[PDB]
């Protein structure tokens, strides 16, 4: 708690990350100042990094694409014939797929039932508060 010349050199000595910029510093001894914050250091460096990897959302897009692919296509197609006679056809295909690449959305029953008539607003009531008719409790004393 020294009068800023000191706080600043101390920040350097103590290896405060960055340094004083962003800190609030005491001055003198009392009659308390120090609502003063040194503005964040200009051009705080973005140290070179390799932090970008496919995001999980990017992964979901890819995994969902995989699911769609395997929903429609086999996991693996055999190549056992390929060049045998003209049988590019007749290759066995592998349809069992890892759970992580299976679809998982339940039957869209609420989109398929198609009730013949649209829903309504199920209004119910007890009627008017007959003892509350023509009775105003919102009166400013005059």
């Amino acid at each position: 708690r020294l009068s800023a010349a000191y706080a600043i050199r101390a920040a350097r000595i103590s290896m405060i990350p960055g340094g004083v910029d962003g800190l609030v510093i005491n001055y003198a001894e009392g009659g308390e100042p120090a609502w003063v914050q040194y503005p964040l250091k200009k051009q705080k460096p973005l140290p070179n990094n390799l932090c970008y990897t496919p995001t999980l959302e990017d992964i979901a897009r890819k995994r969902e694409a995989v699911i769609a692919k395997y929903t429609k296509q086999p996991l693996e197609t055999g190549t056992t014939f390929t060049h045998v006679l003209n049988a590019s056809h007749l290759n066995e295909q592998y349809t069992r797929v890892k759970k992580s690449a299976l679809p998982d959305k339940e039957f869209p029953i609420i989109e398929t039932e198609k009730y013949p008539e649209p829903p309504i607003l199920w209004e119910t009531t007890i009627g008017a508060p007959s003892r509350l008719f023509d009775r105003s409790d919102g009166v400013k004393y005059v």
């Binding site: 120090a34 609502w35 039932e113 009730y115 829903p119």
Partner: protein, 435 residues
């Protein structure tokens, strides 16, 4: 002097707490809310009730939304105090929630017990026991009304109140299966209690009555309710043995985004028994005296915090063959996981592993989506059952890796998983998005 002498003691270090103040603590402004009211309305239960019976109820259209559901049971003691253990919980074997013919969820008597063991606490837990058991040393023939709350997603928070008004064309119902036997009520261990009364049952549903603007929005607009579901598979426990350390690898046939797994080992003979019997106070019928037996539990003290009577030495969860986390001791799942994630105190024999930061809440906070994991396996290592249960010196002076010879009675294993799903409601119909 006084408070002012502190108030004036300001400086640079206080700026980060009170400089450029934004908020005070002395001006709370409450939110204005839509006018609503709640009425607890009795439902009609279809089908005969009694022990072993299965009945159901449609939740009637009395209000617009529903939350709490309470099942009232009337039971009479078939023996004296110490013979029952949360009998109202034992009685309600299971409850199935169906909307529009789709199974949304399902709870089990054991889950009600496991759930309580993990998630309720302090006075909240004691109240719950008061509503499901006899806790004032009541005697044979005593009659008591027990209230078993439901713990389905809409019974947890008003935030998930089921908008029956938005389900104009789909029935909503609960199916309740009653246990064939309830300890200390119609049976005592394996023996039936002659003359025991059959239960009287009633279901109450708390209905929310909305004002016009809110009622309209629910009835008119589509909704997406992020809800939780319970998954459950019961299985054989690698039977504990006195000669070695049994082990077991259980492939978990779970799905969805899972907040946590929970499990227990139990003796299927006695509801709530998750630990070995022993001749130490509270660990068996007559424990501590000449009449003690380590073949029958002290029913009133079926549950315990005495870890030496638990059977899990250690466990880990693997995902696609790889360790999810380093192997930890059974006592870690029993004591620490709940400490960290819930804050309550879990009985020996009951274990929790969270994939979530705050599994006891409603807000999702990290999940393990098993619909994206080809092979999720729970690996369990058991303690060696070398300790003679009838001798406290052995029961109490033993080591970390061993347990009671009576721990071999804990042959049933229950593995649960709690996960999120989406209950979509639109055009008068509702149902789940994933399975």
């Amino acid at each position: 002097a006084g408070g002012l002498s502190q108030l004036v003691a300001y400086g640079a270090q206080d700026v980060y707490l009170t400089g450029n103040p934004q908020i005070t603590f002395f001006k709370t402004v409450y939110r204005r809310y839509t006018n609503f009211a709640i009425e607890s309305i009795q439902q009609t239960i279809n089908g005969s009730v009694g022990f072993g019976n299965k009945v159901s109820t449609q939740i009637s259209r009395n209000g617009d939304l529903i939350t709490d559901i309470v099942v009232e049971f009337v039971l009479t003691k078939g023996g004296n105090g110490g013979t029952t253990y949360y009998p109202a919980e034992e009685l309600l074997q299971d409850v199935e929630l169906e909307i529009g013919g789709q199974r949304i969820d399902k709870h089990y008597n054991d889950w009600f017990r496991t759930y309580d063991a993990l998630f309720r606490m302090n006075d909240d837990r004691y109240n719950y026991r008061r509503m499901t058991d006899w806790v004032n040393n009541e005697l044979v023939g005593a009659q008591k009304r027990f209230y078993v709350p439901l713990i389905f997603f809409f019974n947890q928070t008003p935030g998930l109140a089921l908008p029956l008004i938005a389900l104009q064309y789909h029935e909503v119902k609960l199916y309740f299966t009653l246990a064939s036997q309830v300890q200390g009520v119609n049976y005592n261990g394996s023996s039936a209690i002659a003359g025991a009364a059959q239960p009287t049952m009633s279901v109450w549903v708390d209905y929310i009555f909305l004002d016009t603007q809110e009622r309209t929005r629910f009835a008119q607009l589509p909704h997406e309710y992020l809800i939780e579901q319970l998954q459950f598979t019961g299985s054989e426990t690698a039977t504990p043995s006195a000669t070695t350390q049994a082990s077991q690898n259980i492939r978990l046939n779970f799905n969805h985004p899972t907040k946590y797994l929970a499990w227990n080992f139990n003796n299927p003979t006695n509801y709530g028994q998750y630990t070995a019997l022993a001749n130490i106070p509270g660990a068996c019928s007559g424990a501590g005296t000449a009449a003690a037996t380590v073949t029958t539990p002290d029913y009133g003290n079926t549950g315990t915090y005495n870890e030496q009577l638990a059977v899990l030495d250690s466990a880990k969860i693997q995902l696609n063959g790889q360790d999810r986390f380093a192997t930890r001791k059974g006592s870690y799942f029993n004591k620490v996981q709940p400490y960290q994630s819930i804050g309550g105190v879990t009985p020996a024999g009951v274990y929790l592993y969270s994939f979530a930061l705050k599994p006891a809440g409603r807000q999702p906070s990290g999940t393990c989506n098993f619909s994206r994991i080809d092979n999720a396996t729970l690996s369990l290592t058991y303690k060696t059952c070398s300790i003679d249960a009838t001798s406290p010196a052995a029961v109490l002076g033993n080591t970390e890796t061993v347990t009671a010879n009576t721990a071999t009675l804990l042959t049933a294993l229950n593995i649960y998983a709690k996960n999120y799903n989406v209950l979509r409601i639109m055009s008068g119909m509702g149902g789940l998005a994933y399975a």
